[PDB]
Amino acid sequence: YVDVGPDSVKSACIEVDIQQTFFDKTWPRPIDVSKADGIIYPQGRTYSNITITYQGLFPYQGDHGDMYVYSAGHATGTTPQKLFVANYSQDVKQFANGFVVRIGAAANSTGTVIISPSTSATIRKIYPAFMLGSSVGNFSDGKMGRFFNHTLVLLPDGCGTLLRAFYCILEPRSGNHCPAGNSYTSFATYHTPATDCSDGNYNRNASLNSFKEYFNLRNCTFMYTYNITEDEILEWFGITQTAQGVHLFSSRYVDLYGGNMFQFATLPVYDTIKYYSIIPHSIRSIQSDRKAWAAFYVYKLQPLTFLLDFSVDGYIRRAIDCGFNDLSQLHCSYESFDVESGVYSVSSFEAKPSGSVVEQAEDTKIASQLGNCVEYSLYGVSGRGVFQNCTAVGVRQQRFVYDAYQNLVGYYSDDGNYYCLRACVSVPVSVIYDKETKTHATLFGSVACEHISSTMSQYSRSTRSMLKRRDSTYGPLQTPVGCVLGLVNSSLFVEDCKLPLGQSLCALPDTPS
Amino acid sequence: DTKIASQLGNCVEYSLYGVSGRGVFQNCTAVGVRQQRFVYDAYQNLVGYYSDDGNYYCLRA
Amino acid sequence: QVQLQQSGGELVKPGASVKLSCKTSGFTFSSSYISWLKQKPGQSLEWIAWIYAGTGGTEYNQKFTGKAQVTVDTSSSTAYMQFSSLTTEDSAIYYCARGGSSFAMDYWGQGTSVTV
Amino acid sequence: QLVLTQSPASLAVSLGQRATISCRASESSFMNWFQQKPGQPPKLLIHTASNQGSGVPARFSGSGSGTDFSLNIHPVEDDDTAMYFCQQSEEVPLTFGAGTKLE
Ligand SMILES: *[C@@H]1O[C@H](CO)[C@@H](O[C@@H]2O[C@H](CO)[C@@H](O[C@@H]3O[C@H](CO[C@H]4O[C@H](CO)[C@@H](O)[C@H](O)[C@@H]4O)[C@@H](O)[C@H](O[C@H]4O[C@H](CO)[C@@H](O)[C@H](O)[C@@H]4O)[C@@H]3O)[C@H](O)[C@H]2NC(C)=O)[C@H](O)[C@H]1NC(C)=O
Ligand SMILES: *[C@@H]1O[C@H](CO)[C@@H](O[C@@H]2O[C@H](CO)[C@@H](O[C@@H]3O[C@H](CO)[C@@H](O)[C@H](O)[C@@H]3O)[C@H](O)[C@H]2NC(C)=O)[C@H](O)[C@H]1NC(C)=O
Ligand SMILES: *[C@@H]1O[C@H](CO)[C@@H](O[C@@H]2O[C@H](CO)[C@@H](O)[C@H](O)[C@H]2NC(C)=O)[C@H](O)[C@H]1NC(C)=O
Ligand SMILES: *[C@@H]1O[C@H](CO)[C@@H](O[C@@H]2O[C@H](CO)[C@@H](O)[C@H](O)[C@H]2NC(C)=O)[C@H](O)[C@H]1NC(C)=O
Ligand SMILES: *[C@@H]1O[C@H](CO)[C@@H](O)[C@H](O)[C@H]1NC(C)=O
Ligand SMILES: *[C@@H]1O[C@H](CO)[C@@H](O)[C@H](O)[C@H]1NC(C)=O
Ligand SMILES: *[C@@H]1O[C@H](CO)[C@@H](O)[C@H](O)[C@H]1NC(C)=O
Ligand SMILES: *[C@@H]1O[C@H](CO)[C@@H](O)[C@H](O)[C@H]1NC(C)=O
Ligand SMILES: *[C@@H]1O[C@H](CO)[C@@H](O)[C@H](O)[C@H]1NC(C)=O
Ligand SMILES: *[C@@H]1O[C@H](CO)[C@@H](O)[C@H](O)[C@H]1NC(C)=O
């Protein structure tokens, strides 16, 4: 196996004080795909000068990210004391197809030093530490987040100047505050800037050595080091796993001042990663050397369709999350928004299913439920819909009545009633869009305003926020064409709005300042 | 076995990092993305390639 | 009052195994580290192993690996030290103590005399 | 582990007099002092260079840092005839020095 150096000889571990309330801050730093945030450059080829639509692993628009806060440890003001951390080691998430991280989001801003809320300092970029693997469980004292067999550890070291990527069996040490000993909370890594971040001589093993206080490294299959240029530049970094190994991606080597993420390394981990968590970290600084650190944000990746805009230099400088809203689905299909009108039919509202109705001679009350949209199973006949109490149509005693298109019309139940089936009803939608003012209004058609509200629980798209900006202050207005939000009654007559609604109605654009 | 690093040109068969085809290479300016080697067009055809000699060639098939 | 009570001694031949024990009281066994040490007359003391009774976690002195096993039975508040394949160089007084890791050894058993 | 050297090898101190016993580490501060009376296991006297152990008389006062540690027994009783040892608990394997004989 791989020689990763000796075990720590310390008889005990540093005590770790986990105080989550001090890390309980709100500072979302979301992905805005319109500037291609979080977009990982597609692999295997390149393009330039083009907009394409592509399905692949991407973060989604508006993902704020899980915020990970690293902090100064306890100190007497002369010397460091105990570590001070967030409860991150137990925060085990599904790996699935991977995830991405925003690093240094708050860099160069000034803010809290966390351990002492009234104290602020210039915020520095710190690289995230992770523990990943195929299986997790409990520790011998009942703590969570134990990884089994070989565990992948991503542990930045040297005060953020090297990445140590390794895969070893982590053998817990039994000493005081160690994972197999007395008074264990959570292992956490640390460095001590007073001795570890000396200019020209960083302790490149400071975080490795602290890690080693809690676990011995055994049967290592690998340990690789990557160097990191020290800067405060906003950085994209991320990870995925494929049949060929574990792919480490960053904007750091290819697009440092841009953000497109590119693969820079692959680790030989063929055991599907199912679980991961953030390694808590604390800096053993003193009060007079107490710094603030940027939180990092973790966003998940998933197979999403995006429009990706490639500049002449081949970098993605804009992207569209096609399913984000109704207008965005249209932009992907229609390439852009000023294309013709932007006045197009949009994806409809599904229905929103209710608990089922089941009957079959061969838990309550599922005999019937009237009604809205309920799943059902009746004598082997399945579907979803709303039942209505209605008069019988024949033939009697044959139970299930079907229409001209061979669909179920209704059913004779064992309670003696006949119900008409209307399946589920839905809300059709269309959007009136003005490419000049960059605004819109929407119709629900035939649904009518008695069933319309500014919010919806149906649903047709992930967000309705572009309309809410104005529509949140108006009720729906009912017109002969259909029910509309964002209409404003002005009682005007115009020849052509370039947004006619048909009939004798027209949606008039407002006037640019 | 030599010289097959490049041949400019007229209509030459090729195999570049697993990418195959036939065509003429032209010495031309780079279009991106840099460091991803193979640039493709609107029809998903190869436009050009970054070679290990530091040059970028345009492919006209 | 904290007490550590060890078993009496024994005479064995080389190749023999011996099992030592140390029953303790006056403290919670499961909250303490119990260390085992080897000492010969005229010599300093050498630590063999410790066990945290509360987790069963252990640590050993490499000169005894493959020969020594430290274990506990918390239901009887007892620490044990098992040795196998003893040689004449293992004739010693074996001691148990309350302490281990970073904890100083405040309480000791009387010592168990094993002659090989 | 850490190797410890003690000095003096032995010392005679009369009743009512102070006994100074020193220890020097080969390297570097959780140094503990023990007293092993003839026929007894070691008892802890000092821990972490200067603190008193459990049930330990004020007569036993320690100090030290780095590689250099000491114990001052004052007054010495005839009943303090014992081996005095330094032990290092900072690192594992835990170790004891050769010991000083106080008479
Ligand atoms: C920070 O932490 C890193 C962890 O990577 C340390 O890097 C390791 O450093 C140790 C030494 O400190 C290296 O181990 C030694 O490697 C020598 C040669 O290495 C090559 O050949 C070996 C053959 O086994 C390969 O394993 C290795 O990958 C290289 O190809 C060996 O000759 C040494 O052998 C001697 O010591 C060992 C015990 O350690 C004895 O068993 C041998 O008999 C002999 O006496 C030894 O194996 C280790 O390889 C490095 N690991 C990695 C992953 O690179 C840094 O050194 C450390 N930095 C600081 C400042 O502490
Ligand atoms: C925190 O402050 C630092 C320091 O100002 C910021 O780093 C700087 O970011 C700018 C913008 O990317 C860099 O400018 C670039 O210069 C290159 C030079 O060729 C140019 O090609 C790029 O197009 C761009 O103009 C600047 O160089 C960089 N500073 C350093 C030392 O590299 C940092 O981005 C700020 N971080 C945050 C999170 O706000
Ligand atoms: C991965 O580690 C786990 C635990 O560290 C191993 O499972 C143990 O196997 C032993 C075999 O006797 C059992 O007694 C333990 O109770 C098991 N523990 C758990 C948590 O299941 C597992 O076998 C290791 N897998 C590999 C491939 O080494
Ligand atoms: C590293 O690999 C060695 C074997 O090459 C492991 O040693 C075995 O561990 C299992 C665990 O149940 C024992 O049942 C075997 O008897 C051990 N074999 C030998 C020869 O002792 C070792 O445990 C692995 N390291 C870690 C930390 O798991
Ligand atoms: C860890 O222990 C807790 C104790 O309540 C238990 O609920 C939990 O399910 C355990 N987790 C695992 C993975 O065994
Ligand atoms: C990082 O830079 C130092 C500079 O001396 C070099 O020695 C080390 O090998 C480099 N490591 C990596 C991973 O490039
Ligand atoms: C992009 O297309 C325009 C069309 O006129 C062309 O002039 C320009 O050179 C192209 N750039 C690249 C990188 O192909
Ligand atoms: C409603 O149920 C009652 C049950 O007696 C039935 O008589 C009535 O005709 C049903 N409604 C319709 C429209 O048939
Ligand atoms: C607009 O106001 C007029 C006032 O008479 C009313 O008749 C008309 O129905 C209103 N239209 C809407 C959609 O509210
Ligand atoms: C031809 O090759 C040279 C090599 O230095 C390069 O500089 C030049 O720009 C190339 N021609 C074109 C049109 O780019």
Side-chain angles (χ1 to χ4, degrees), chain A residues 41 43 45-48 50 254 262 312-315, chain B residues 31-42 44:
Chain A
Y41 179 81
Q43 299 294 299
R45 59 171 63 194
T46 176
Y47 297 89
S48 66
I50 190 166
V254 179
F262 293 79
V312 296
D313 65 13
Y315 290 93
Chain B
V31 300
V33 77
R34 300 304 302 271
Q35 305 187 41
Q36 297 296 305
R37 289 184 181 279
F38 296 90
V39 180
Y40 294 83
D41 72 9
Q44 308 292 295

PDB file of all heavy atoms in Angstrom, chain A residues 41 43 45-48 50 254 262 312-315, chain B residues 31-42 44:
ATOM      1  N   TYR A  41     -17.965  23.205 -17.774  1.00  0.00           N
ATOM      2  CA  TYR A  41     -17.729  23.126 -19.182  1.00  0.00           C
ATOM      3  C   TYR A  41     -17.986  21.671 -19.653  1.00  0.00           C
ATOM      4  O   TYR A  41     -17.505  20.737 -19.000  1.00  0.00           O
ATOM      5  CB  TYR A  41     -16.301  23.548 -19.456  1.00  0.00           C
ATOM      6  CG  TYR A  41     -16.016  23.456 -20.827  1.00  0.00           C
ATOM      7  CD1 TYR A  41     -16.401  24.448 -21.681  1.00  0.00           C
ATOM      8  CD2 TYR A  41     -15.415  22.338 -21.270  1.00  0.00           C
ATOM      9  CE1 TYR A  41     -16.179  24.268 -22.984  1.00  0.00           C
ATOM     10  CE2 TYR A  41     -15.212  22.168 -22.546  1.00  0.00           C
ATOM     11  CZ  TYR A  41     -15.589  23.096 -23.392  1.00  0.00           C
ATOM     12  OH  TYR A  41     -15.430  22.868 -24.642  1.00  0.00           O
ATOM     13  N   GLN A  43     -17.603  18.142 -21.376  1.00  0.00           N
ATOM     14  CA  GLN A  43     -16.344  17.479 -21.710  1.00  0.00           C
ATOM     15  C   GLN A  43     -16.380  16.673 -22.999  1.00  0.00           C
ATOM     16  O   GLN A  43     -17.432  16.216 -23.442  1.00  0.00           O
ATOM     17  CB  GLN A  43     -15.918  16.579 -20.549  1.00  0.00           C
ATOM     18  CG  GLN A  43     -15.683  17.338 -19.242  1.00  0.00           C
ATOM     19  CD  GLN A  43     -14.495  18.285 -19.316  1.00  0.00           C
ATOM     20  OE1 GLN A  43     -13.355  17.862 -19.542  1.00  0.00           O
ATOM     21  NE2 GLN A  43     -14.753  19.559 -19.141  1.00  0.00           N
ATOM     22  N   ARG A  45     -15.240  17.745 -25.990  1.00  0.00           N
ATOM     23  CA  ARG A  45     -15.157  18.633 -27.128  1.00  0.00           C
ATOM     24  C   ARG A  45     -15.382  20.085 -26.780  1.00  0.00           C
ATOM     25  O   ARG A  45     -15.899  20.419 -25.709  1.00  0.00           O
ATOM     26  CB  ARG A  45     -16.128  18.254 -28.224  1.00  0.00           C
ATOM     27  CG  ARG A  45     -17.577  18.221 -27.881  1.00  0.00           C
ATOM     28  CD  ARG A  45     -18.397  18.039 -29.129  1.00  0.00           C
ATOM     29  NE  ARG A  45     -18.169  16.782 -29.813  1.00  0.00           N
ATOM     30  CZ  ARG A  45     -18.579  16.496 -31.087  1.00  0.00           C
ATOM     31  NH1 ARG A  45     -19.263  17.371 -31.815  1.00  0.00           N
ATOM     32  NH2 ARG A  45     -18.274  15.320 -31.607  1.00  0.00           N
ATOM     33  N   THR A  46     -15.073  20.935 -27.738  1.00  0.00           N
ATOM     34  CA  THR A  46     -15.349  22.343 -27.650  1.00  0.00           C
ATOM     35  C   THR A  46     -16.039  22.965 -28.827  1.00  0.00           C
ATOM     36  O   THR A  46     -16.077  22.409 -29.920  1.00  0.00           O
ATOM     37  CB  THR A  46     -14.106  23.155 -27.290  1.00  0.00           C
ATOM     38  OG1 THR A  46     -14.480  24.532 -27.319  1.00  0.00           O
ATOM     39  CG2 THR A  46     -12.873  22.915 -28.071  1.00  0.00           C
ATOM     40  N   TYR A  47     -16.708  24.072 -28.518  1.00  0.00           N
ATOM     41  CA  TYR A  47     -17.452  24.926 -29.430  1.00  0.00           C
ATOM     42  C   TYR A  47     -17.173  26.373 -29.123  1.00  0.00           C
ATOM     43  O   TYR A  47     -16.778  26.710 -28.009  1.00  0.00           O
ATOM     44  CB  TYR A  47     -18.951  24.711 -29.315  1.00  0.00           C
ATOM     45  CG  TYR A  47     -19.408  23.364 -29.678  1.00  0.00           C
ATOM     46  CD1 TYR A  47     -19.464  22.373 -28.731  1.00  0.00           C
ATOM     47  CD2 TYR A  47     -19.786  23.112 -30.972  1.00  0.00           C
ATOM     48  CE1 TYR A  47     -19.888  21.132 -29.090  1.00  0.00           C
ATOM     49  CE2 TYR A  47     -20.206  21.870 -31.328  1.00  0.00           C
ATOM     50  CZ  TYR A  47     -20.257  20.883 -30.397  1.00  0.00           C
ATOM     51  OH  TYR A  47     -20.673  19.642 -30.761  1.00  0.00           O
ATOM     52  N   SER A  48     -17.417  27.230 -30.090  1.00  0.00           N
ATOM     53  CA  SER A  48     -17.292  28.656 -29.896  1.00  0.00           C
ATOM     54  C   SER A  48     -18.315  29.319 -30.780  1.00  0.00           C
ATOM     55  O   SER A  48     -18.810  28.705 -31.732  1.00  0.00           O
ATOM     56  CB  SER A  48     -15.899  29.127 -30.268  1.00  0.00           C
ATOM     57  OG  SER A  48     -15.671  28.963 -31.635  1.00  0.00           O
ATOM     58  N   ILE A  50     -21.501  30.122 -30.438  1.00  0.00           N
ATOM     59  CA  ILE A  50     -22.766  29.407 -30.615  1.00  0.00           C
ATOM     60  C   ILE A  50     -23.643  29.253 -29.372  1.00  0.00           C
ATOM     61  O   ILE A  50     -23.154  29.049 -28.265  1.00  0.00           O
ATOM     62  CB  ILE A  50     -22.456  27.995 -31.190  1.00  0.00           C
ATOM     63  CG1 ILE A  50     -23.759  27.270 -31.636  1.00  0.00           C
ATOM     64  CG2 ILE A  50     -21.667  27.163 -30.154  1.00  0.00           C
ATOM     65  CD1 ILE A  50     -23.526  26.052 -32.498  1.00  0.00           C
ATOM     66  N   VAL A 254      -8.106  26.803 -15.601  1.00  0.00           N
ATOM     67  CA  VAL A 254      -8.488  27.110 -16.980  1.00  0.00           C
ATOM     68  C   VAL A 254      -9.213  28.460 -17.133  1.00  0.00           C
ATOM     69  O   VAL A 254      -9.113  29.098 -18.190  1.00  0.00           O
ATOM     70  CB  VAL A 254      -9.323  25.970 -17.584  1.00  0.00           C
ATOM     71  CG1 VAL A 254      -9.748  26.317 -19.029  1.00  0.00           C
ATOM     72  CG2 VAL A 254      -8.519  24.693 -17.568  1.00  0.00           C
ATOM     73  N   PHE A 262     -13.639  23.362 -15.147  1.00  0.00           N
ATOM     74  CA  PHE A 262     -13.054  22.341 -16.027  1.00  0.00           C
ATOM     75  C   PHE A 262     -12.450  21.198 -15.239  1.00  0.00           C
ATOM     76  O   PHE A 262     -12.020  21.383 -14.105  1.00  0.00           O
ATOM     77  CB  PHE A 262     -11.978  22.960 -16.910  1.00  0.00           C
ATOM     78  CG  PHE A 262     -12.484  23.939 -17.925  1.00  0.00           C
ATOM     79  CD1 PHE A 262     -12.793  25.230 -17.574  1.00  0.00           C
ATOM     80  CD2 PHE A 262     -12.595  23.576 -19.258  1.00  0.00           C
ATOM     81  CE1 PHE A 262     -13.214  26.116 -18.506  1.00  0.00           C
ATOM     82  CE2 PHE A 262     -13.010  24.486 -20.199  1.00  0.00           C
ATOM     83  CZ  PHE A 262     -13.328  25.754 -19.816  1.00  0.00           C
ATOM     84  N   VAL A 312     -16.814  33.621 -28.562  1.00  0.00           N
ATOM     85  CA  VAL A 312     -15.792  33.284 -29.551  1.00  0.00           C
ATOM     86  C   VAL A 312     -14.585  32.578 -28.926  1.00  0.00           C
ATOM     87  O   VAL A 312     -13.839  31.857 -29.610  1.00  0.00           O
ATOM     88  CB  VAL A 312     -15.306  34.560 -30.261  1.00  0.00           C
ATOM     89  CG1 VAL A 312     -16.452  35.157 -31.024  1.00  0.00           C
ATOM     90  CG2 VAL A 312     -14.748  35.575 -29.244  1.00  0.00           C
ATOM     91  N   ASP A 313     -14.379  32.810 -27.627  1.00  0.00           N
ATOM     92  CA  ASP A 313     -13.270  32.229 -26.907  1.00  0.00           C
ATOM     93  C   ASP A 313     -13.652  30.890 -26.307  1.00  0.00           C
ATOM     94  O   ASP A 313     -12.855  30.283 -25.592  1.00  0.00           O
ATOM     95  CB  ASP A 313     -12.743  33.203 -25.841  1.00  0.00           C
ATOM     96  CG  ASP A 313     -13.719  33.518 -24.699  1.00  0.00           C
ATOM     97  OD1 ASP A 313     -14.722  32.829 -24.556  1.00  0.00           O
ATOM     98  OD2 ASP A 313     -13.462  34.437 -23.951  1.00  0.00           O
ATOM     99  N   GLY A 314     -14.857  30.408 -26.619  1.00  0.00           N
ATOM    100  CA  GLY A 314     -15.317  29.099 -26.215  1.00  0.00           C
ATOM    101  C   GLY A 314     -15.827  28.971 -24.796  1.00  0.00           C
ATOM    102  O   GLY A 314     -16.180  27.867 -24.380  1.00  0.00           O
ATOM    103  N   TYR A 315     -15.866  30.059 -24.045  1.00  0.00           N
ATOM    104  CA  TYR A 315     -16.335  29.959 -22.675  1.00  0.00           C
ATOM    105  C   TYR A 315     -17.833  30.257 -22.617  1.00  0.00           C
ATOM    106  O   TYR A 315     -18.368  31.051 -23.404  1.00  0.00           O
ATOM    107  CB  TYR A 315     -15.529  30.878 -21.751  1.00  0.00           C
ATOM    108  CG  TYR A 315     -14.031  30.461 -21.488  1.00  0.00           C
ATOM    109  CD1 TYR A 315     -13.022  30.968 -22.277  1.00  0.00           C
ATOM    110  CD2 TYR A 315     -13.685  29.609 -20.447  1.00  0.00           C
ATOM    111  CE1 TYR A 315     -11.693  30.660 -22.046  1.00  0.00           C
ATOM    112  CE2 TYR A 315     -12.335  29.295 -20.219  1.00  0.00           C
ATOM    113  CZ  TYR A 315     -11.344  29.821 -21.006  1.00  0.00           C
ATOM    114  OH  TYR A 315      -9.984  29.552 -20.762  1.00  0.00           O
TER     115      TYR A 315
ATOM    116  N   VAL B  31      -9.687  29.644 -32.094  1.00  0.00           N
ATOM    117  CA  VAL B  31     -11.020  29.970 -31.659  1.00  0.00           C
ATOM    118  C   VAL B  31     -11.123  29.093 -30.445  1.00  0.00           C
ATOM    119  O   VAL B  31     -10.451  28.070 -30.416  1.00  0.00           O
ATOM    120  CB  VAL B  31     -12.028  29.606 -32.740  1.00  0.00           C
ATOM    121  CG1 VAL B  31     -11.700  30.392 -34.002  1.00  0.00           C
ATOM    122  CG2 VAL B  31     -11.981  28.147 -33.004  1.00  0.00           C
ATOM    123  N   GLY B  32     -11.970  29.382 -29.493  1.00  0.00           N
ATOM    124  CA  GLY B  32     -11.921  28.536 -28.316  1.00  0.00           C
ATOM    125  C   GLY B  32     -12.739  27.253 -28.322  1.00  0.00           C
ATOM    126  O   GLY B  32     -13.279  26.855 -29.360  1.00  0.00           O
ATOM    127  N   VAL B  33     -12.799  26.590 -27.142  1.00  0.00           N
ATOM    128  CA  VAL B  33     -12.169  26.991 -25.875  1.00  0.00           C
ATOM    129  C   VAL B  33     -10.758  26.433 -25.784  1.00  0.00           C
ATOM    130  O   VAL B  33     -10.478  25.294 -26.201  1.00  0.00           O
ATOM    131  CB  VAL B  33     -12.998  26.567 -24.634  1.00  0.00           C
ATOM    132  CG1 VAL B  33     -12.846  25.177 -24.362  1.00  0.00           C
ATOM    133  CG2 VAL B  33     -12.631  27.392 -23.443  1.00  0.00           C
ATOM    134  N   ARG B  34      -9.851  27.235 -25.271  1.00  0.00           N
ATOM    135  CA  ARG B  34      -8.496  26.785 -25.164  1.00  0.00           C
ATOM    136  C   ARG B  34      -8.394  25.641 -24.194  1.00  0.00           C
ATOM    137  O   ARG B  34      -9.131  25.560 -23.212  1.00  0.00           O
ATOM    138  CB  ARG B  34      -7.569  27.911 -24.740  1.00  0.00           C
ATOM    139  CG  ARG B  34      -7.516  29.125 -25.703  1.00  0.00           C
ATOM    140  CD  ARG B  34      -7.141  28.730 -27.088  1.00  0.00           C
ATOM    141  NE  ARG B  34      -5.841  28.056 -27.170  1.00  0.00           N
ATOM    142  CZ  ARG B  34      -4.642  28.653 -27.343  1.00  0.00           C
ATOM    143  NH1 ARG B  34      -4.548  29.964 -27.473  1.00  0.00           N
ATOM    144  NH2 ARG B  34      -3.546  27.905 -27.389  1.00  0.00           N
ATOM    145  N   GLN B  35      -7.440  24.768 -24.479  1.00  0.00           N
ATOM    146  CA  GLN B  35      -7.085  23.570 -23.726  1.00  0.00           C
ATOM    147  C   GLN B  35      -8.104  22.425 -23.834  1.00  0.00           C
ATOM    148  O   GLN B  35      -7.910  21.394 -23.197  1.00  0.00           O
ATOM    149  CB  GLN B  35      -6.927  23.895 -22.220  1.00  0.00           C
ATOM    150  CG  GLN B  35      -5.932  25.008 -21.872  1.00  0.00           C
ATOM    151  CD  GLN B  35      -5.710  25.132 -20.352  1.00  0.00           C
ATOM    152  OE1 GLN B  35      -5.607  24.121 -19.651  1.00  0.00           O
ATOM    153  NE2 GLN B  35      -5.629  26.357 -19.849  1.00  0.00           N
ATOM    154  N   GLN B  36      -9.126  22.537 -24.699  1.00  0.00           N
ATOM    155  CA  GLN B  36     -10.054  21.411 -24.875  1.00  0.00           C
ATOM    156  C   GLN B  36      -9.864  20.674 -26.205  1.00  0.00           C
ATOM    157  O   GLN B  36     -10.649  19.804 -26.590  1.00  0.00           O
ATOM    158  CB  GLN B  36     -11.469  21.875 -24.625  1.00  0.00           C
ATOM    159  CG  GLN B  36     -11.653  22.358 -23.176  1.00  0.00           C
ATOM    160  CD  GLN B  36     -11.452  21.282 -22.167  1.00  0.00           C
ATOM    161  OE1 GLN B  36     -12.108  20.249 -22.236  1.00  0.00           O
ATOM    162  NE2 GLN B  36     -10.543  21.487 -21.224  1.00  0.00           N
ATOM    163  N   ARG B  37      -8.806  21.050 -26.907  1.00  0.00           N
ATOM    164  CA  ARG B  37      -8.312  20.451 -28.148  1.00  0.00           C
ATOM    165  C   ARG B  37      -9.150  20.484 -29.416  1.00  0.00           C
ATOM    166  O   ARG B  37      -8.670  20.952 -30.440  1.00  0.00           O
ATOM    167  CB  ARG B  37      -7.928  19.004 -27.937  1.00  0.00           C
ATOM    168  CG  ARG B  37      -6.704  18.786 -27.121  1.00  0.00           C
ATOM    169  CD  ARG B  37      -6.361  17.337 -27.065  1.00  0.00           C
ATOM    170  NE  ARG B  37      -5.187  17.090 -26.261  1.00  0.00           N
ATOM    171  CZ  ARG B  37      -3.912  17.242 -26.693  1.00  0.00           C
ATOM    172  NH1 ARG B  37      -3.629  17.663 -27.895  1.00  0.00           N
ATOM    173  NH2 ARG B  37      -2.894  16.976 -25.914  1.00  0.00           N
ATOM    174  N   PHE B  38     -10.363  19.961 -29.379  1.00  0.00           N
ATOM    175  CA  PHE B  38     -11.153  19.843 -30.614  1.00  0.00           C
ATOM    176  C   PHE B  38     -12.383  20.733 -30.680  1.00  0.00           C
ATOM    177  O   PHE B  38     -13.318  20.555 -29.896  1.00  0.00           O
ATOM    178  CB  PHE B  38     -11.578  18.394 -30.789  1.00  0.00           C
ATOM    179  CG  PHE B  38     -10.462  17.440 -30.984  1.00  0.00           C
ATOM    180  CD1 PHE B  38      -9.874  16.837 -29.903  1.00  0.00           C
ATOM    181  CD2 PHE B  38      -9.994  17.135 -32.243  1.00  0.00           C
ATOM    182  CE1 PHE B  38      -8.846  15.954 -30.072  1.00  0.00           C
ATOM    183  CE2 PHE B  38      -8.978  16.258 -32.419  1.00  0.00           C
ATOM    184  CZ  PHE B  38      -8.402  15.669 -31.328  1.00  0.00           C
ATOM    185  N   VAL B  39     -12.379  21.667 -31.639  1.00  0.00           N
ATOM    186  CA  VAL B  39     -13.429  22.660 -31.842  1.00  0.00           C
ATOM    187  C   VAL B  39     -14.375  22.159 -32.905  1.00  0.00           C
ATOM    188  O   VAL B  39     -13.929  21.874 -34.008  1.00  0.00           O
ATOM    189  CB  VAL B  39     -12.838  23.998 -32.331  1.00  0.00           C
ATOM    190  CG1 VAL B  39     -13.985  25.007 -32.525  1.00  0.00           C
ATOM    191  CG2 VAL B  39     -11.749  24.514 -31.360  1.00  0.00           C
ATOM    192  N   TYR B  40     -15.667  22.153 -32.605  1.00  0.00           N
ATOM    193  CA  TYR B  40     -16.733  21.701 -33.486  1.00  0.00           C
ATOM    194  C   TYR B  40     -17.698  22.832 -33.877  1.00  0.00           C
ATOM    195  O   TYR B  40     -17.802  23.834 -33.170  1.00  0.00           O
ATOM    196  CB  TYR B  40     -17.450  20.546 -32.821  1.00  0.00           C
ATOM    197  CG  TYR B  40     -16.587  19.341 -32.665  1.00  0.00           C
ATOM    198  CD1 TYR B  40     -15.739  19.259 -31.619  1.00  0.00           C
ATOM    199  CD2 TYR B  40     -16.662  18.309 -33.545  1.00  0.00           C
ATOM    200  CE1 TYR B  40     -14.964  18.162 -31.446  1.00  0.00           C
ATOM    201  CE2 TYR B  40     -15.875  17.200 -33.389  1.00  0.00           C
ATOM    202  CZ  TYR B  40     -15.023  17.125 -32.332  1.00  0.00           C
ATOM    203  OH  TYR B  40     -14.231  16.008 -32.140  1.00  0.00           O
ATOM    204  N   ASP B  41     -18.351  22.684 -35.048  1.00  0.00           N
ATOM    205  CA  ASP B  41     -19.303  23.655 -35.618  1.00  0.00           C
ATOM    206  C   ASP B  41     -20.772  23.422 -35.223  1.00  0.00           C
ATOM    207  O   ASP B  41     -21.128  22.544 -34.436  1.00  0.00           O
ATOM    208  CB  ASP B  41     -19.255  23.709 -37.178  1.00  0.00           C
ATOM    209  CG  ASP B  41     -19.842  22.486 -37.891  1.00  0.00           C
ATOM    210  OD1 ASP B  41     -20.430  21.701 -37.198  1.00  0.00           O
ATOM    211  OD2 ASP B  41     -19.769  22.361 -39.098  1.00  0.00           O
ATOM    212  N   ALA B  42     -21.655  24.195 -35.861  1.00  0.00           N
ATOM    213  CA  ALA B  42     -23.102  24.164 -35.646  1.00  0.00           C
ATOM    214  C   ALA B  42     -23.754  22.832 -35.997  1.00  0.00           C
ATOM    215  O   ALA B  42     -24.890  22.568 -35.594  1.00  0.00           O
ATOM    216  CB  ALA B  42     -23.758  25.239 -36.485  1.00  0.00           C
ATOM    217  N   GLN B  44     -22.084  19.989 -35.509  1.00  0.00           N
ATOM    218  CA  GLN B  44     -21.291  19.075 -34.690  1.00  0.00           C
ATOM    219  C   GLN B  44     -20.090  18.470 -35.425  1.00  0.00           C
ATOM    220  O   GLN B  44     -19.561  17.440 -34.989  1.00  0.00           O
ATOM    221  CB  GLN B  44     -22.185  17.906 -34.207  1.00  0.00           C
ATOM    222  CG  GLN B  44     -23.501  18.314 -33.525  1.00  0.00           C
ATOM    223  CD  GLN B  44     -23.329  18.987 -32.204  1.00  0.00           C
ATOM    224  OE1 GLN B  44     -22.838  18.369 -31.247  1.00  0.00           O
ATOM    225  NE2 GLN B  44     -23.721  20.254 -32.121  1.00  0.00           N
TER     226      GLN B  44
END
